[PDB]
Design a protein around this nucleic acid. Structure first.
Ligand SMILES: [Mg+2]
Ligand SMILES: [Mg+2]
Ligand SMILES: [Mg+2]
Ligand SMILES: [Mg+2]
Ligand SMILES: [Mg+2]
Ligand SMILES: [Mg+2]
Ligand SMILES: [Mg+2]
Ligand SMILES: [Mg+2]
Ligand SMILES: [Mg+2]
Ligand SMILES: [Mg+2]
Ligand SMILES: [Mg+2]
Ligand SMILES: [Mg+2]
Ligand SMILES: [Mg+2]
Ligand SMILES: [Mg+2]
Ligand SMILES: [Mg+2]
Ligand SMILES: [Mg+2]
Ligand SMILES: [Mg+2]
Ligand SMILES: [Mg+2]
Ligand SMILES: [Mg+2]
Ligand SMILES: [Mg+2]
Ligand SMILES: [Mg+2]
Ligand SMILES: [Mg+2]
Ligand SMILES: [Mg+2]
Ligand SMILES: [Mg+2]
Ligand SMILES: [Mg+2]
Ligand SMILES: [Mg+2]
Ligand SMILES: [Mg+2]
Ligand SMILES: [Mg+2]
Ligand SMILES: [Mg+2]
Ligand SMILES: [Mg+2]
Ligand SMILES: [Mg+2]
Ligand SMILES: [Mg+2]
Ligand SMILES: [Mg+2]
Ligand SMILES: [Mg+2]
Ligand SMILES: [Mg+2]
Ligand SMILES: [Mg+2]
Ligand SMILES: [Mg+2]
Ligand SMILES: [Mg+2]
Ligand SMILES: [Mg+2]
Ligand SMILES: [Mg+2]
Ligand SMILES: [Mg+2]
Ligand SMILES: [Mg+2]
Ligand SMILES: [Mg+2]
Ligand SMILES: [Mg+2]
Ligand SMILES: [Mg+2]
Ligand SMILES: [Mg+2]
Ligand SMILES: [Mg+2]
Ligand SMILES: [Mg+2]
Ligand SMILES: [Mg+2]
Ligand SMILES: [Mg+2]
Ligand SMILES: [Mg+2]
Ligand SMILES: [Mg+2]
Ligand SMILES: [Mg+2]
Ligand SMILES: [Mg+2]
Ligand SMILES: [Mg+2]
Ligand SMILES: [Mg+2]
Ligand SMILES: [Mg+2]
Ligand SMILES: [Mg+2]
Ligand SMILES: [Mg+2]
Ligand SMILES: [Mg+2]
Ligand SMILES: [Mg+2]
Ligand SMILES: [Mg+2]
Ligand SMILES: [Mg+2]
Ligand SMILES: [Mg+2]
Ligand SMILES: [Mg+2]
Ligand SMILES: [Mg+2]
Ligand SMILES: [Mg+2]
Ligand SMILES: [Mg+2]
Ligand SMILES: [Mg+2]
Ligand SMILES: [Mg+2]
Ligand SMILES: [Mg+2]
Ligand SMILES: [Mg+2]
Ligand SMILES: [Mg+2]
Ligand SMILES: [Mg+2]
Ligand SMILES: [Mg+2]
Ligand SMILES: [Mg+2]
Ligand SMILES: [Mg+2]
Ligand SMILES: [Mg+2]
Ligand SMILES: [Mg+2]
Ligand SMILES: [Mg+2]
Ligand SMILES: [Mg+2]
Ligand SMILES: [Mg+2]
Ligand SMILES: [Mg+2]
Ligand SMILES: [Mg+2]
Ligand SMILES: [Mg+2]
Ligand SMILES: [Mg+2]
Ligand SMILES: [Mg+2]
Ligand SMILES: [Mg+2]
Ligand SMILES: [Mg+2]
Ligand SMILES: [Mg+2]
Ligand SMILES: [Mg+2]
Ligand SMILES: [Mg+2]
Ligand SMILES: [Mg+2]
Ligand SMILES: [Mg+2]
Ligand SMILES: [Mg+2]
Ligand SMILES: [Mg+2]
Ligand SMILES: [Mg+2]
Ligand SMILES: [Mg+2]
Ligand SMILES: [Mg+2]
Ligand SMILES: [Mg+2]
Ligand SMILES: [Mg+2]
Ligand SMILES: [Mg+2]
Ligand SMILES: [Mg+2]
Ligand SMILES: [Mg+2]
Ligand SMILES: [Mg+2]
Ligand SMILES: [Mg+2]
Ligand SMILES: [Mg+2]
Ligand SMILES: [Mg+2]
Ligand SMILES: [Mg+2]
Ligand SMILES: [Mg+2]
Ligand SMILES: [Mg+2]
Ligand SMILES: [Mg+2]
Ligand SMILES: [Mg+2]
Ligand SMILES: [Mg+2]
Ligand SMILES: [Mg+2]
Ligand SMILES: [Mg+2]
Ligand SMILES: [Mg+2]
Ligand SMILES: [Zn+2]
Lengths: 151, 122, 208, 99, 138
RNA sequence: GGGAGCAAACCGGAUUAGAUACCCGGGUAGUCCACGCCCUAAACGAUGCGCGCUAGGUCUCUGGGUCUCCUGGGGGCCGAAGCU
RNA sequence: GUAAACUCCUGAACCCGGGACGAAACCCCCGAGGAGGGGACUGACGGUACCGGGGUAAUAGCGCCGGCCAACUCCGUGCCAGCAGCCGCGGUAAUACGGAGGGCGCGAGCGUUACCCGGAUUCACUGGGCGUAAAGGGCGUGUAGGCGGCCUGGGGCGUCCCAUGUG
């Protein structure tokens, strides 16, 4: 249904008498390009099954994104423990200037104009989570004046 | 470090040092060969490589690599130094510029010939 | 000096149909439709996953190949398109279609964007009654892009213009098949143009 | 024009002259924090009416000597040795630095 | 000894809200009132009142909070997700009218102390003045 | 100045390929006191000082109060939120 | 690889004709030696720019193609020869060495070396830290300095607004 795309695949390992058995990792983003976006990470003894699992887990953890005409409502400096990322809105015709990771996410988010920067740890996995939790925290004048309403 | 600490002690300006004292901050440095030789490479690899000590117009005396297969440098050959480390040969910070001065370009070489001072054939 | 050389190989690389040539590109092949795959010994081998860079690159080169214009020029414009307020993406395209040699093609006087340049340099062209040979020329709005006095009677010009009548062209353009004149009504527009290229991709490419 | 500033007298030992200490404050160029800074001026006192611990106003004036280029304009408020002490103590500690 | 009472208050509001207190207190001050007034008058807190604690003047600040949420940890929304003192005693921060921050693209606020009184960021540009960037909230 | 015990160095015994050691039998400076130097350490919570604010459960040391408890000041453990 | 040949079309170069702007004032009469008017001289560049006519298909390189990083196969070579910015490649089956084919990237340029800022958020004001990763002083006392609670009033140095000068 949605646009499917993954950031990284990786083969981990685990020692064991006689040898080292492997698993594969898959960081996958899913998005409608209109607001819905989600991210999954799945592991499985083979690549394809791994991408599938990631695709599945991804379709679970979804999130809306308050796009104000291709852009974001307001900047945010969310730090995911070790990693830190900075989203910042921009005028149209700017395009999405970001690293491989937030690029993949923000794009499927249907975002098209936004400048960013990955301060702190550059770890893909954590940079990914950071971006998600980042978006999950965006707000519009609506939700805002809605809270300063308390009606 | 508190602002006041900063107001006083301040921040320490970095300053890096020249990876290559070819002196004069020059792009190149003429010099005369003095010990055309053949040294064994670093730990992981192995293949007697062509090097030569040079007395420079800058006063220093340094080793530099000879690029390409085979060469023509003797004890008194004049040559132009380029500079460019060699991860394989510890201590070599420079490179011979093939095809300039007594340095000859690679004979019968078709690809990347420019990096070796080799005219285009017929 | 411009491109010169096998152009249909470009048709094949970008994968998209590049309407550079005249008759052929509408025949049973812009080179395409017989060899839809890229040039070279491979091309028809299992295609490899493309990097973000591959994309931003090609989508950029695809636009450049289209206007068959130099890298130095193409770039000096993108930056000029940034200084100007207004969507840099669309604006850059704007400065492109305002390019004289291109006007000549969009006005139908030429079969190709390339034969358009030729006509221009050789001076077969005029703009407000003044010969011009620089394909670079930035055509302002409201300009009599007419055929040269001498040039009027000529196998090609006549032939191209003849074939041109009836065919309504360019929402921002005004063809006068009568005196072989034409006018740059106004700078084009976002949707007035149609091209196999997401301009945002080029913006992202030139961020590095 | 003809700059004028205020400061305490910290010396009167000279003939027809006094040393005035003037503070001045301003934000740090890079760190903002309003930082203090000061400077002694040799002022012309053609009667040594002004004395130690006096706060005064000295004005940019015609060169009187090698260092003297300000005449004392008027007494702001007499007696403030407390300030002089700070400056004298600031000095005292210098002894405890050499080797 | 307390170095800066203002940041303390902001911190008292911050630590209070993190646990979802109905309200907390803080020693009285003409200045502190103004900060609360603007803070409440902008919908960040319900209000306040000069309560008393053992003959000691305080200002009980009544906190505001969002509704309950769904899913794991129904931890409600915060009305003040972010409060932070800017111009510290360790380094005062003064600004010209032009400099004043846009704060979270208009969504946020930023109290300034000025020769016209205490007033939010937009207010300063409104009546065209500048002053000590006290802090900001959103 | 003092010197019982212990004990670097030292001597002998044993072990070992060797044993300039671990074990054993001896043993000096020292360890003790006065006055004076030395100023180092895993001088370690490997966590600078002061202040304010943010659940509780239990254990203990020490003060005050009619006291299955209340209220200060310390010493441990378990743990909210939160941090890492 | 439409690439070539071939067909047709245009016409850089070259040939011929014409050929500047830049130059109006000094000066000379009218007026008065003023204001005004009028009259004349001077071009190195240069027979150059440019205009008009005739008119020939008319140089292409250099870097790269293991990952960063766009671009793959064949042969030679066998830790040799050599590559290399970092990671690393070569020890019979190398897309990393060398040549070729093809490909990618720029183009009268392409690469190389040097230097500066960037990336470097790695001297961190913006915008970093110090239990175990580099980093709390062995502990106190205290000097200068830095910083400091609630209320009322004076001053207006910092701070702020305006005008003006300068920039
Ligand atoms: Mg994994
Ligand atoms: Mg499944
Ligand atoms: Mg599941
Ligand atoms: Mg965090
Ligand atoms: Mg975490
Ligand atoms: Mg952190
Ligand atoms: Mg980014
Ligand atoms: Mg970064
Ligand atoms: Mg220094
Ligand atoms: Mg190097
Ligand atoms: Mg030479
Ligand atoms: Mg060459
Ligand atoms: Mg250039
Ligand atoms: Mg003509
Ligand atoms: Mg940029
Ligand atoms: Mg950049
Ligand atoms: Mg000032
Ligand atoms: Mg001084
Ligand atoms: Mg003198
Ligand atoms: Mg004198
Ligand atoms: Mg001393
Ligand atoms: Mg000293
Ligand atoms: Mg000494
Ligand atoms: Mg000395
Ligand atoms: Mg009060
Ligand atoms: Mg700050
Ligand atoms: Mg005794
Ligand atoms: Mg004795
Ligand atoms: Mg004894
Ligand atoms: Mg004994
Ligand atoms: Mg003995
Ligand atoms: Mg014996
Ligand atoms: Mg022994
Ligand atoms: Mg043994
Ligand atoms: Mg022995
Ligand atoms: Mg011994
Ligand atoms: Mg003894
Ligand atoms: Mg001794
Ligand atoms: Mg004792
Ligand atoms: Mg005794
Ligand atoms: Mg005694
Ligand atoms: Mg002594
Ligand atoms: Mg001691
Ligand atoms: Mg020490
Ligand atoms: Mg310990
Ligand atoms: Mg501590
Ligand atoms: Mg402490
Ligand atoms: Mg309790
Ligand atoms: Mg118990
Ligand atoms: Mg008790
Ligand atoms: Mg009682
Ligand atoms: Mg204790
Ligand atoms: Mg104890
Ligand atoms: Mg306890
Ligand atoms: Mg927890
Ligand atoms: Mg032929
Ligand atoms: Mg024809
Ligand atoms: Mg013909
Ligand atoms: Mg002609
Ligand atoms: Mg000519
Ligand atoms: Mg002529
Ligand atoms: Mg003439
Ligand atoms: Mg003149
Ligand atoms: Mg005249
Ligand atoms: Mg003259
Ligand atoms: Mg006369
Ligand atoms: Mg006359
Ligand atoms: Mg006259
Ligand atoms: Mg002439
Ligand atoms: Mg002439
Ligand atoms: Mg002539
Ligand atoms: Mg012809
Ligand atoms: Mg040709
Ligand atoms: Mg031809
Ligand atoms: Mg090449
Ligand atoms: Mg290259
Ligand atoms: Mg490759
Ligand atoms: Mg490579
Ligand atoms: Mg590559
Ligand atoms: Mg490279
Ligand atoms: Mg060989
Ligand atoms: Mg072989
Ligand atoms: Mg082979
Ligand atoms: Mg091999
Ligand atoms: Mg190869
Ligand atoms: Mg080739
Ligand atoms: Mg270039
Ligand atoms: Mg270059
Ligand atoms: Mg330099
Ligand atoms: Mg640098
Ligand atoms: Mg970096
Ligand atoms: Mg770095
Ligand atoms: Mg560093
Ligand atoms: Mg870094
Ligand atoms: Mg700094
Ligand atoms: Mg750091
Ligand atoms: Mg350590
Ligand atoms: Mg300590
Ligand atoms: Mg230490
Ligand atoms: Mg120590
Ligand atoms: Mg010490
Ligand atoms: Mg003392
Ligand atoms: Mg002292
Ligand atoms: Mg003090
Ligand atoms: Mg104060
Ligand atoms: Mg003070
Ligand atoms: Mg009162
Ligand atoms: Mg007050
Ligand atoms: Mg009063
Ligand atoms: Mg006051
Ligand atoms: Mg003032
Ligand atoms: Mg005013
Ligand atoms: Mg102003
Ligand atoms: Mg001004
Ligand atoms: Mg002015
Ligand atoms: Mg002005
Ligand atoms: Mg100006
Ligand atoms: Zn075609």
């Amino acid at each position: 249904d949605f646009e499917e795309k993954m950031i990284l695949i990786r083969r981990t390992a685990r020692m064991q008498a006689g040898g080292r058995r492997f698993r594969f990792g898959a960081l996958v983003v899913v998005g409608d390009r209109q607001g819905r976006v989600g991210l999954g990470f799945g592991k499985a003894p083979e690549v394809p099954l791994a991408v599938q699992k990631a695709g599945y887990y991804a379709r679970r953890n979804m999130v809306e994104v308050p796009l104000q005409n291709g852009t974001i409502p307001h900047e945010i400096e969310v730090e995911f423990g070790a990693s830190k990322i900075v989203l910042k809105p921009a005028a149209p015709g700017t395009g999405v200037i970001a690293g491989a990771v937030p690029r993949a996410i923000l794009e499927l988010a249907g975002v098209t104009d936004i400048l960013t920067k990955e301060l702190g740890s550059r770890n893909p996995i954590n940079i990914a989570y950071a971006t998600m939790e980042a978006l999950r925290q965006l707000r519009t004048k609506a939700d805002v004046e809605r809270l300063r309403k308390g009606e | 470090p508190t602002i006041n600490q900063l107001v006083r002690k301040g921040r320490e300006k970095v300053r890096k040092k020249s990876k290559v004292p070819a002196l004069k901050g020059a792009p190149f440095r003429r010099g005369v060969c003095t010990v055309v030789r053949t040294v064994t490479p670093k730990k992981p690899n192995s293949a007697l490589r062509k090097v030569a000590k040079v007395r420079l117009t800058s006063g220093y005396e340094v080793t530099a690599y000879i690029p390409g297969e085979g060469h023509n440098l003797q004890e008194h050959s004049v040559v132009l130094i380029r500079g460019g480390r060699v991860k394989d040969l510890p201590g070599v910070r420079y490179h011979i510029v093939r095809g300039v001065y007594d340095a000859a370009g690679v004979k019968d070489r078709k690809k990347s010939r420019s990096k070796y001072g080799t005219k285009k054939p017929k | 000096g411009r491109y010169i050389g096998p152009v249909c190989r470009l048709c094949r690389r970008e994968g998209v149909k590049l309407y550079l040539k005249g008759e052929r590109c509408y025949s049973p092949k812009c080179a395409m439709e017989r060899r839809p795959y890229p040039p070279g010994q491979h091309g028809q081998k299992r295609a490899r996953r493309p990097s973000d860079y591959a994309v931003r690159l090609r989508e950029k080169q695809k636009l450049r190949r289209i206007y068959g214009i130099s890298e130095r020029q193409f770039r000096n414009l993108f930056e000029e398109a940034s200084k100007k307020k207004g969507v840099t993406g669309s604006v850059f395209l704007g400065l492109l279609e305002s390019r004289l040699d291109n006007v000549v093609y969009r006005l139908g006087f030429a079969v190709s964007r390339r034969q358009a340049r030729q006509l221009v340099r050789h001076g077969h062209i005029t703009v407000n009654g003044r010969r011009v040979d620089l394909p670079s020329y930035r055509v302002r709005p409201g300009d009599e892009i007419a055929v040269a006095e001498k040039s009027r009677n000529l196998e090609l010009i006549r032939q191209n213009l003849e074939a041109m009548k009836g065919r309504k062209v360019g929402p921002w353009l005004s063809l006068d098949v009568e005196g072989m004149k034409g006018k740059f009504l106004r700078l084009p527009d976002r949707e007035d143009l149609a091209l196999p290229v997401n301009e945002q991709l080029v913006i992202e490419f030139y961020s590095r | 024009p003809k700059k004028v500033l205020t400061g305490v007298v910290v010396s009167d030992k000279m003939q027809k002259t006094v040393t005035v200490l003037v503070e001045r404050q301003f934000p740090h160029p890079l760190y903002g924090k309003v930082i203090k800074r000061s400077k002694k001026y040799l002022a012309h006192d053609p009667e040594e009416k002004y004395k130690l611990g006096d706060v005064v106003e000295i004005i940019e004036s015609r060169p009187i000597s090698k260092r003297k280029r300000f005449r004392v304009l008027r007494l702001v408020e007499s007696g403030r040795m407390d300030l002089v002490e700070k400056y004298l103590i600031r000095r005292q500690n210098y002894q405890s630095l050499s080797k | 000894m307390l170095t800066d009472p203002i940041a303390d208050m902001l911190t008292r509001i911050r630590n209070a809200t993190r646990v979802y207190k109905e309200s907390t207190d803080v020693p009285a001050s003409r200045f502190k009132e103004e900060i609360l007034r603007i803070l409440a008058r902008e919908g960040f807190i319900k209000g306040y009142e000069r309560v008393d604690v053992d003959g000691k003047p305080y200002l009980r600040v009544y906190l505001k909070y969002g509704p309950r949420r769904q899913g794991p940890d129904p931890r409600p929304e915060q009305v003040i997700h972010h409060i932070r003192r800017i111009s510290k005693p360790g380094r005062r921060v003064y600004v010209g009218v032009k400099e004043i921050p846009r704060v979270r693209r208009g969504l946020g606020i930023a109290i300034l102390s000025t020769s016209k009184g205490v007033l939010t960021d937009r207010e300063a540009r409104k009546l065209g003045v500048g002053g000590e960037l006290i802090c900001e909230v959103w």
